[PDB]
């Protein structure tokens, strides 16, 4: 099927582009219902939780915003009290009540019923022995549990988690012990990054804190003695933050799942809805942007294009904010349609050197490419280069047929350049060809495939369609259009399957066609299964609207061959009888 401009157009119409946007800020976790309900359950139950999602989602900002709205009972005062001159314990009193117990003791069961063991052990034998380090150490206190303590420690070192012993010259005492993140988060929330616990080697010590209440201030190797610090009942909720991959290290520890029961997973995409466009606008305004309707619409549509889905939008608020900040500079402080389009263009320019070199090499004939005419056994497939920002390029492919003993040879795979999935695609094509053409017994052909100017590894199955049509062309002696690039995976039954990076692929063929001078007949054949992924850039949409570029969507390899060879498989003088006649020719050459 031909894809009209109207079928390809995906962008949001803009009405009153320059009108200022006025919208209220959305709640924390907008469009992230799964993660929000997980966190609500963790808050309601006192459970430890982990926030999981790809980088640049805004996971940290959403979490701190949501925790800021919570309310708990005012946290107890928290202190170290000495039970001896070599031993300390962590104590909670009701709030504000340690400043009284400090004055009392500075009177060198009075009404501090919980502070007993400190006082009991505070008894006598200075008078009994003339024996010449003893007053309580307040770690924390606060006025209200609204908002609760919220401690985000990105740097999960033992001293930052557990506190430190200072040494006043050597000795030490209760009064020289500094609190850590764990102490500051009591009655509230400690937030840590999974990657920092791994990188800092503090995961085992952290588990000992949560499982056993072992919280040991960091000491030093010199100090001729230390204090014993008694374990204490931990009163805190821990929320870990990280990527799926940051967690996988931790997840192989059975203790991880035991301690962190509540998974709060962010979706990498939201529905592309009016409500999520509106929420994005209110979010950008709350960040301080001066947003026009046109600037909101373009950012919203760039989020859809980022997701490579007409119906979804990229959920990475941090990535949308960074693009908006570059737009705001190009707009002199105003976030407009133009400033967004021009920020996108300047990103591509700043990463274009590789493509400028490639396009110059094609123009000079140093890379041999055809974008017009016809040739047997040759096709432009499409690839993306595996370095950000993943530019697409045509990849010239040849198929040559000789009389032989049913061999399909991938030259790139035999030379070691082709990966396992690339190999799988060649095997799959072999299975299709052998089973499709059985009249002579096993295929009377040896077919060799080569990516002609490929010096580097190729992986993926998306050149399967180009490889199969090249192969059929070589068998039947079928001239194929070189003005249409081909992308698609094939199954053993000859059906065309979805491929990745379809926008980069299409745009990369358009870019080469344009650099060599558009003929008016160039285009791409791609999988019908990718229609929902097509969010093509303005310049390609306008070329298709102008009749200067053409998109074809297919379901079968044979539908692709019919377009490339300019004929039907049947209505015979069709391609199928030419393919059969080529196989009969090869079979005769192969026997006597």
């Amino acid at each position: 099927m031909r894809l009209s401009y109207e079928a390809l157009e995906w962008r949001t119409p803009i009405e009153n582009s320059t009108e200022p946007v006025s919208l209220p800020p959305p709640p924390p976790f907008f469009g992230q219902e799964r993660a929000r309900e997980a966190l609500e359950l963790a808050i309601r139950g006192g459970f430890h939780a982990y926030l999981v999602g790809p980088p640049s989602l805004g996971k940290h900002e959403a979490l701190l915003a949501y925790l800021s709205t919570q309310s708990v009972e005012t946290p107890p005062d928290l202190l170290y009290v000495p039970l001896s001159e070599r031993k300390v314990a962590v104590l909670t009193l009701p709030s504000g009540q340690e400043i009284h117990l400090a004055e009392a003791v500075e009177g060198l069961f009075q009404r501090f019923p919980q502070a007993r063991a400190y006082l009991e052990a505070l008894r006598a034998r200075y008078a009994e022995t003339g024996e010449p380090q003893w007053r309580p150490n307040l770690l924390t206190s606060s006025s209200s549990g609204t908002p609760p303590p919220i401690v985000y420690e990105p740097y999960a070192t033992a001293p930052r988690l557990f506190g430190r012993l200072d040494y006043l010259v050597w000795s030490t005492n209760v009064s020289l012990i500094r609190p850590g993140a764990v102490h500051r988060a009591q009655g509230g929330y400690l937030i840590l990054d999974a990657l920092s616990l791994k990188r800092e080697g503090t995961w085992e010590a952290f588990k000992r804190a949560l499982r056993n209440g072992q919280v040991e201030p960091v000491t030093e190797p010199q100090a001729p003695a230390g204090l014993e610090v008694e374990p204490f009942p931990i009163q805190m909720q821990v929320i870990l933050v990280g990527t799926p991959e940051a967690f996988e290290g931790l997840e192989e520890d059975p203790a991880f799942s035991e301690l962190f029961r509540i998974r709060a997973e962010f979706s990498p995409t939201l529905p592309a809805s009016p409500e999520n466009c509106t929420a994005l606008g209110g979010w950008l305004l709350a960040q301080g942007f001066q947003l026009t309707q046109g600037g909101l619409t373009r950012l919203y549509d760039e989020a859809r294009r980022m997701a490579e889905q007409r119906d979804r939008m990229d959920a990475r608020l941090v990535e949308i904010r960074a693009l908006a900040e570059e737009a705001a500079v190009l707009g002199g402080g105003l976030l407009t349609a133009e400033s967004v389009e021009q920020a996108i263009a300047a990103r591509e320019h700043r990463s274009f050197l590789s493509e400028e070199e490639f396009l110059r090499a094609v123009q000079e004939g140093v890379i041999r490419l055809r974008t017009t005419g016809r040739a047997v056994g040759e096709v432009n497939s499409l690839v993306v280069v595996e370095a950000a920002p993943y530019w697409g390029r045509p990849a010239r492919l040849t198929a040559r047929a000789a009389p032989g003993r049913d061999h399909l040879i991938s030259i790139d795979r035999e030379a070691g350049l082709g990966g396992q999935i690339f190999h799988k695609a060649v095997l799959t094509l072999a299975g299709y060809l052998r089973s499709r053409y059985i009249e002579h017994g096993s295929l009377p052909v040896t077919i060799s495939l080569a990516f002609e100017q490929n010096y580097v590894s190729i992986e993926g199955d998306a050149a399967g369609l180009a490889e199969l049509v090249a192969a059929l062309s070589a068998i039947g002696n079928l001239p194929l259009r070189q003005d249409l690039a081909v992308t698609g995976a094939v199954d053993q039954t000859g059906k065309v399957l979805a491929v990745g990076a379809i926008n980069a692929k299409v745009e990369g063929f358009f870019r080469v066609c344009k650099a060599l001078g558009l003929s008016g007949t160039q285009g791409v054949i791609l999988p019908e299964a990718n229609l929902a992924n097509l969010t093509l850039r303005a310049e390609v949409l306008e070329a298709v609207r102008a009749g200067q570029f053409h998109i074809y969507a297919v379901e079968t390899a044979e539908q692709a061959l019919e377009i490339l060879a300019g004929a039907r498989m049947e209505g015979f003088r069709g391609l199928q009888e030419k393919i059969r006649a080529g196989l009969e020719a090869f079979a005769r050459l192969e026997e006597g």
Binding site: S381, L382, V383, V384, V385, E386, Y390, R393, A395, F422, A425, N454, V456, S457, I458, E459, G460, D461, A462, A463, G464, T487, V499, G500, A501
Partner: peptide, 4 residues
């Protein structure tokens, strides 16, 4: 490296 390229990717199809």
């Amino acid at each position: 490296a390229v990717y199809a």
